[PDB]
Structure 1
Amino acid sequence: KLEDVVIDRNLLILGKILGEGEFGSVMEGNLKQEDGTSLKVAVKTMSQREIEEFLSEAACMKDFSHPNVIRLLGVCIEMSSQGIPKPMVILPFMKYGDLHTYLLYSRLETGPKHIPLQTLLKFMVDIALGMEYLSNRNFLHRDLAARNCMLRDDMTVCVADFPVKWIAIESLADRVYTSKSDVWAFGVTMWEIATRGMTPYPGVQNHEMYDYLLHGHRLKQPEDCLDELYEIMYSCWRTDPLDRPTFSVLRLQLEKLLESLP
């Protein structure tokens, strides 16, 4: 259940805040490894059922191994002074942070260097490689977005999960979720990357989203987005879920597109 994923609270040292809000709090931390060495980590803390659902999320994350899906380093159990459990999820710390902030930063002079096309396409390939993995596992992500993608120390992206505009039209009206709903969100993520941090659908408010989409309107081709990267991303927004490509078809579409450019 939680055996081999639980870490004794003694082995964790919490530091400053990385980000706060209404998905808990994520902070830097030191994790004492059975190696005897210490490791830099991100510890996301946060209610009766929200506790067990929190531990339920580490369930069907405990055993996920792919270079493009975020690793779990463990779960912790902190006892309140009142004795209530306070669950904590432990992740490897990533100095480069989430992809959304990194895309915006690239447009500033003192942030990361200007990201070329080949690198933006590798960003999507990484997400495609990982979501393809998670699709084979028959795991529904349901929150795919640039803000949820983390950058590894080797500048490879990995999928994670800390929002109407990333939700497929079929899931908006009827509260359902298929693998194809995930694929719709992937199309929006490639839009964020190709726009380098733009909020989806400029000009349209959240409450109009279902109707905007019900009238056949889709995200606009980003300026300087090449005319075949847009088809791959537009293919994720077909109205029938069954008519959308699979994560494995998309990945190849991006891989062979990447190695056509110099």
Structure 2
Amino acid sequence: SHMEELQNKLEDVVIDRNLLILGRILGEGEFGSVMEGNLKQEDGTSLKVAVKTMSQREIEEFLSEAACMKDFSHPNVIRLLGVCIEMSSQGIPKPMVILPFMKYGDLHTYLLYSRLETGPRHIPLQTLLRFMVDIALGMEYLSNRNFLHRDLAARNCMLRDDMTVCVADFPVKWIAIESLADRVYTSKSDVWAFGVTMWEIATRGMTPYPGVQNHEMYDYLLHGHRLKQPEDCLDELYEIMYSCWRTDPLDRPTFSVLRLQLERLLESLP
């Protein structure tokens, strides 16, 4: 049963606080913190992990959502290893998300660093397209199980040690024309965000819509303007990203269609 499944997943997602030690802060904000940790595994050895730290309703909501996310199982979707709920000395709940430690970090920062001499080398065309195919694959998986991401952007995609990209962390310039209008939000809204993310990748990390301010965005799109084609981006790659921003959501391709379009393009390169 539907209740049965949710109880199982809840059982599976929680981690004994004993099995975890927290280390240095890697990052910090109004969101909360990201810290390094070690997780003791069933096999007796420890794993390096990343720990993201953030009413009983709100806690149960977190747990239920965490339960669903742990259940995703795809190479291009980040594996949620589990959650711990600690409490502050003020008696405020401190929910912790346990994720793999990814030494190459988020895709956005990686693109920026490739433009510096000490960072990764210049990233060729083929590899930038590969990153897009990986993200599409992860998004194809999620939409096929009716999950909406809602914050898809290059900063929320992670690079794994083998250079595979996975979608993670489930921002006016990423938001589709109709979710600006109606606050209405489908998987075709995620498709819109994916096209923007593809543009971030093809520009090696530019902010979308240079020259245009966040308050101007809705009116800019309302008059039919879209992101411009990046320099040295194939015409056919641009066509694909432009399809993501078609005014009417039903005209946008699905992630499945996009993904095959991107794989074909990639296949065709020397």
1:93-135 deviations in Å (ceiling 9; x for gaps): 0000000000000000100011000000000000000100001
Partner SS for 1:69: coil
Q: Quote the offset at 1:46 in angstroms.
A: 1.2
SS of 1:62's equivalent?
Answer: helix
Offset at residue 60 of structure 1 (A): 2.2
Contact 1:171 1:181 in 2 (8 A): yes
The question of whether the paired residues in 1 share the 8 Å contact of 2:23 and 2:35 is answered with yes
Over 2 Å off, 4+ runs: 47-57, 79-85
Does the 8 Å CA contact 1:8/1:77 hold for their aligned counterparts?
no
Deviates more, 1:52-61 or 1:243-252: 52-61
TM-score if structure 1 supplies the norm length?
A: 0.96
- Structure 1 unaligned blocks of 5 or more: none
RMSD: 1.4
| Contact 2:12–2:67 (Cα < 8 Å) also in 1 | no
The structure 1 residue matched to 2:147, chosen from 139, 151, 154, is 139
The Cα of 1:80 is off from its aligned counterpart by 2.9
* Other structure's SS at 2:116 match: coil
Unaligned runs of 5+ in 2: 1-8
Query: Once the 2 structures are TM-superposed, how far is the Cα of residue 47 of structure 1 from its aligned partner?
Result: 6.6
* Residue deviations 1:158-193 (CA, integer Å, cap 9, x gap): 000170000000110101110100000000000000
- Cα 1:110–1:223 change in 2 (3 A) is same
Flag the 1:23–1:82 CA change in 2: closer, same or farther, 3 A: closer
Does the 8 Å contact 1:144/1:189 carry over to 2?
yes
| CA distance in 2 between partners of 1:100 and 1:57 (Å) | 26
**Separation in structure 2 between the aligned mates of residue 216 and residue 79 of structure 1, nearest angstrom:** 49
For the 8 Å contact 1:45–1:87, the answer to whether it is kept is yes
**Structure that is richer in helix per residue:** 2
Which residue number corresponds to residue 87 of structure 1?
A: 95
Distance 2:104 2:63 in 1: 27
8 Å Cα contact 1:23/1:162 also seen in 2: no
Could you list the per-position Cα deviations for residues 34-88 of structure 1 after superposition, in whole angstroms to 9, with x for gaps in the alignment?
A: 1100000000001775544433431320200000000011111213335443210
Instruction: Check whether the contact 1:126–1:157 (CA below 8 A) recurs between aligned residues.
Output: yes
- Bigger shift: residues 146-155 or 17-26: 17-26
- The secondary structure found in structure 2 opposite 1:245 is coil
- Distance in 2, matches of 1:162 and 1:180, equals 16
> How far 1:19 sits from its partner (Å)?
1.4
Is the Cα–Cα contact under 8 Å of residues 98 and 147 in structure 1 kept in the other structure? yes
CA distance in 2, matches of 1:118, 1:18: 31
- Higher mean alpha-carbon deviation, 206-215 vs 154-163, is at 154-163
SS, match of residue 105 in structure 2: coil
Asked if structure 1 preserves the Cα contact closer than 8 Å seen for 2:81 and 2:100, the reply is yes
Segment drifting more, 12-21 vs 88-97: 12-21
- Classify the secondary structure of the residue corresponding to 1:237: coil
d(CA) in 1 for partners of 2:62 and 2:12? 17
- Report the identity percentage: 98
Q: What is the CA-CA distance between 1:195 and the residue it aligns to?
A: 0.2
CA contact (8 A) 1:15 1:28 kept: yes
Q: Distance in 2 between matches of 1:23 and 1:234?
A: 32
Matched residue count = 262
